[model samples]
Each structure stands twice: as structure tokens, then as C-alpha cells.
Target: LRPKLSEEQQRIIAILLDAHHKTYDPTYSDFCQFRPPVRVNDGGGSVTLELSQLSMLPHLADLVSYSIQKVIGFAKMIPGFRDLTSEDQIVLLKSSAIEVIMLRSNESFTMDDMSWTCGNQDYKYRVSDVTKAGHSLELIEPLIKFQVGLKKLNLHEEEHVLLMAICIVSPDRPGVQDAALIEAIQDRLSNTLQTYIRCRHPPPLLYAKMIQKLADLRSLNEEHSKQYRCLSFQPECSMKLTPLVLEVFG
Candidate 1:
């Protein structure tokens, strides 16, 4: 006989599944999927060169804003998230937004070229030579490899949603007043993941591999923040990171 889930667990699982479909399912639609065309690239073949100029980069900021806001919104829909203090919600969103976006953006990543397709027949280069923030290879190369590795895992929808939730309810975010509570919640979600993996997967190490990906995701998240700061420092960026974004992610 299957275990009967507690009311709290049932509610949490339902909320998680609902938010998961709403966030990623095409039938449900995603606001973050919007991508407006950039200005003509001066006949340049490289989407990277055309988009990098200060005159042009602002056109792409909305894409970044949309992804961040959507992920934050999705996180807010989780049952455990609603129970957290408002302050903790913001802390977790700020801490994990980019990482969530990065994971979801795997949908767009091209392993062969190491670029993120921005649609309109264009791809934004993530390599060191083209990174908007001018990060060295050491910081970003690992992320590229991590992205490829994550894609190789071929995670199912439930797995993806659960992993994203786990990333947000992290116990270690700075300024979290209820760290113990958050950790306990994270543990519950981890157990859910373990059970799901056991039921649907036979590999002894599949669960362990997924857990390590979370660790890799965290490392990549820190590197992303470091590069994001580099974007803020560049007066040449000719764009501003807004108060809403700054409050959470700055």
C-alpha cells in the first residue's frame, strides 16, 4: 500500500506541482519566454558583438528582469514559501534567482557552441570572450561544464521543479532569521526527491548525482553573482539595474 501523505505534505506537494506546471509548461505559458528583437546588428554575423555595445545592451535587460521575476514569483507560490516570513522570502529569492534562471535556461543552451539562444535567430555567447561582465574563463568555464552536465542528466519535470524548490529554501542565505525552519523544510523536500528517485529510477547513485548537481548549482550561482556585480560597475553598460532587482539581487 502507498503511504498516505499528511495534510501538510499533500498541500505542499500539490502547490509545488501546480507551480511547476505553471512555470514551465508551454500550455500554461511563461512571461519570461518573451524576447523582443534587438536592433539590426550592423550586418554583423555575431549576435554577441551586436548585443554587447552599451547602446544595445539595454534592449536585453528586460529578458533578464523577466526571468528573475518569474522565478521569484514561482517560488512564492510554493506552500512552504508562503509560510516563511516576508523578509526570508526576499532573501531566498535574491540569493537563488540567477541560479534558477540558469537552470531553466538550459532549455536554450547549445552545447556545441556554448551560447544561449535569444531567439530571432540569435544566440548570446556565454564564453569568456563574450561574457557581458568580462569574467575570466576560470569562473565561467565551470558553469558551462555544469550546464552541460545538468542537461546530460535528462531530468524529468517533477525532478526539475523539486530541485528548483530545494534551491530556494536554502538554510544558508544571509539574513535568514529562521534558518533551522528553512533547513527542516529543505530536508522534507529532499526526502520527497529521494522517494521519487527511488520509485522511478533504479540507479543507486542517481539520487546522489542529483544532490551533487545542487552543490554545483550553488557554486555556479556564486559565480553568476560575481559576474552580475561586474555588470553593475560598468558605466559603459548604459543601463541601470532597477530598484526592484537591486533590492533582491544587488
Candidate 2:
């Protein structure tokens, strides 16, 4: 019923689902079928990549982008695609290939030679590596700590949660197709929260507020979820971390 939850990072969203099912279910489309997590999990418990394997490899993100985008070039039509405006339509078309544009930092990738043009605009996306101050891990920690009393991650369970969230939140690496500022937040929050609950120290509603501000960008709502990715396996599992917190109450 949870649809494997990217099985890479599990969003504690399942808890949210059961807890407020009645109030939220009717408000959104594909209420259950969110696009899968980033499949970029870095936690290492059950089925994860070795640390050596990840760090030693430099181009995984590039590889991911290249592979995913290459496929989209060959993909077929889906529902509602025909209804979108050309500008928005272009965004949807490019985003459909998430990994293709995901791993590069700003200025990392560009298509000086894109065969796919937005009619005369020649639609190719460019990204800048600059991150907003609040988005960084170090900047966020103090703010978060003030909200939730800090706990030294001494336990395995705690470590797993910490590790997974770090991986999910900080995929700070850039890609050609990576979303702009607001879209980046959507990718991170949906990817992490959907995978599993990362912590319990503070009420999640506090965290949700931060993410909502990011999601409020009209651009993301207009863009289709189909832009990012679907799934085979997930990031956390591929990273080799034992999957954490499949069973818990909201």
C-alpha cells in the first residue's frame, strides 16, 4: 500500500497518511502515488553502497543524469501533457528526465547542442551552484537545534536517522536538470519525508512549515511530478544502509 516508499529513504509520510488521512486525501492528486524518492539514498544499513564505493566514485550523479535523460529522449506521452502551455510545457518535458539534470552544480552542464528546442527558444536549462543560506546543513543546524534540543547521535537508530536525513537533505551536488530553488526543496522534502520519519525529537509540523514555504513557489505546482523520476530500487538501499523505521506510530 505504501508503494515501496522509494525503499531508499522512507518518509514518515506513512504516519502522516494514516493520521490525517481524512483531511488531506481529498485535497491532492495522486494522493498515494508520489513519484518515488530520489533513489539516491546515502544511508548504509541493509542494501547500501559502501562508503568507499560512493566517495571514490566522482561521477555517479553525472552517470545518473546521463542515463535518465538519455532514456527520456526516447519516452512516450502521458496524460495532460497536451494541455500545458509551451513555456510550462518545455519545463515539463525537460524535467521528465530528472537524473539527467540532477547531479551537476550550476554551470556544471549545458546543452549548447540540444536537438530539442522550445520552438525558437531552443530550451536548454542552466543551473547555478549557489545555494540559499538556509539550505545548507551547517546553517540549518543551529536553527534546527534551537527548535529541537540537541541529542548526540549515540544510538544506532539515531545514527541511521541522522545519516539518512543528511544524505537526503544534502544531495547538494548539482545536475543539469536539477530544479531551481523552490523545486530543490520539493525534491528534498518529498524525497526524505516520503521515505520514512527521520526524527522524533521535535514535532514534524515545525519542519513541514519550512518546507511549505519552499513549496509555495507557483512554478513547482505548475510543473508535473512526472518530471523527476519513477523507481526500480532506492537511494538508501543502494547506499547499503539498513532500511530504518518501517513500523512506528505518528
Candidate 3:
């Protein structure tokens, strides 16, 4: 027998789907229209390479800052999120915003070339291109692999959005004062997700795989935080980062 989402769960899913569509532009339907093959130039090899390496960091920082704004907006719309104490809300958003952004990027992540299309053609990024932003292959490699693996799951839009919501409601984030309340919320969301999988996807291990991805995100967030700290300590690089990035990761 197929389980069904309760009325509350269905409402939550509707809110998530609506918020997601509102905050992100170039929706999935438009993703292919924006993605074109990256151009390779045969000449000006070394000079162009040097310039591009120097330029990618600032642009990526700006892009990340934009993503942070959208993430905060989406988080606010999660049911029960705004009811948290203001301090708890900030703590949760600051801790999980980047991880949520990484998860949401699965929408635009292309397995063929391992590139992300952010809004348009000019905003596309590959792991190699982003490594120019001073990130080591350690973080980027596993990140790309995670994206590839998650993409292969062929998750429904509902499942993907719920995964990100579950990530943000984490009760384990350092300094969470109302752990019990937060965990209650997470448990509800988890139950909804399981019911969703049972009724819709019905693959035996899909729920387990989704939970495992959360674990993977935790480690990736740690490495990203460490690297972000290193990058922001440099006077020049710090200047390039927006205030939101500094506040969240600094």
C-alpha cells in the first residue's frame, strides 16, 4: 500500500515548491537554453590562463553572495523556521546556507561536462574553473563527485527541496539553544520525506541514500568552512568577498 502525505506535509511541500520557483531564475526548464559548450581558445594560452585564474575568484565570490541571498529567502519560507528564536534562526541560516546552496545547485549541475549553469551562459562554472578561486582539489573534487552521485539518483523536485529543508533544520549545529524543538521539526520533516519516498519513488534505498547525502554534506561544509577562513584572512581576497559571505563564513 502507498502511504500518503498528511495535510500538513502536503502544505509544507507546496510552500517549498513555490518558494523554490520564486527565488531561482532560469528554472530547470530554462537550464538547457542557458548552457552552451565552454569555448576553448588555442592561442594566448599562458597569458589568458593567468588572467582567468586571477579573475575567477572575485566573480565566484559575487555569485556565492547572490546565492546566499536566495538561500536566506528560501529558509525563511520553511514552515516553523521563522518561529525559532531570532538567534537560532541566524545560527541555522549561517551554518547551513552554503550547504543548501550546494544542494540546490544540483538543478543546474551538468554531468556531461561537470559544470554548473548559474542563471546564464556567462555564469557557468566547472570544478577546474572554480579551483582558480583558491580552493584546493580536495574540496572541489569531492563536491563534484557528490553532485554527480546525487544527480544520478534522479530525485523528484519534491524530494530535492525536502532534503535541503532537512539540512537547514539540523539540531546539531553548534550553539542551538532549542535542540529539542529543532529536532521535533526535523523529525516531522523526516517522516514526511519517508512517506513521500514510499508513495512516490518507492525505491527501497532512496531514503537511505538521501540521508547519506546529508552526511556527505556535513563533511563538505567543514572543508568549505576551513578553506573559506583561509581565503578571507588574506587582505586582497577578503576585500573581494561580499559582506554576507564574510558574515556567514568569516
Winning candidate number (TM-score) = 3
Models 1 onward score TM values of 0.78, 0.20, 0.87
User: Which regions in candidate 2 have their CA more than 4 angstroms from the true location?
Assistant: 1-58, 67-78, 85-87, 93-250
Candidates 1 and 3 compared: the better one by TM-score is: 3
Point out the higher-scoring one by lDDT: 1 or 3: 3
Residue 214 in model 3: lDDT:
96
Please give the lDDT score at residue 23 for candidate 3: 78
Candidate 2 is scored at a TM of: 0.20
Q: What lDDT score goes with residue 78 in model 2?
A: 17
What is candidate 1's local distance difference test score?
A: 0.67
A best-first ranking of the candidates according to their TM-score comes to: 3, 1, 2
Tens digit per residue, CA lDDT, model 2, 24-119: 222223312322222233432211332223331222333333333333332212112233345443444343333222211111222344121122
Candidates in order: C-alpha RMSD to true structure: 4.4, 20.5, 4.3
